[PDB]
Amino acid sequence: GSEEKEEKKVRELTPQELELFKRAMGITPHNYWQWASRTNNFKLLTDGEWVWVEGYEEHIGKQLPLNQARAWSWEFIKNRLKELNL
């Protein structure tokens, strides 16, 4: 027990929660496997903040294109999700 001196853990990666990500991006069965690759099995960590792909937090803050991009904001996620909402 160290309720302030033990864990700094982030939000976990369940098959239920992760669906919201690919949902917001509008990912299609055509580029599904393509996104599944870049997203490392749609495994992205976050905590009420910008989201990143597990294992690519080492690739954050670098000059990478959208193809090499491995992080997005909650604002961007909602940006596309709001476009999906009609």
Curated annotation (Swiss-Prot):
Taxonomic superkingdom: Bacteria
Protein name per the record: Uncharacterized protein aq_1974
Covered residues, full protein: 31 to 114 of 114
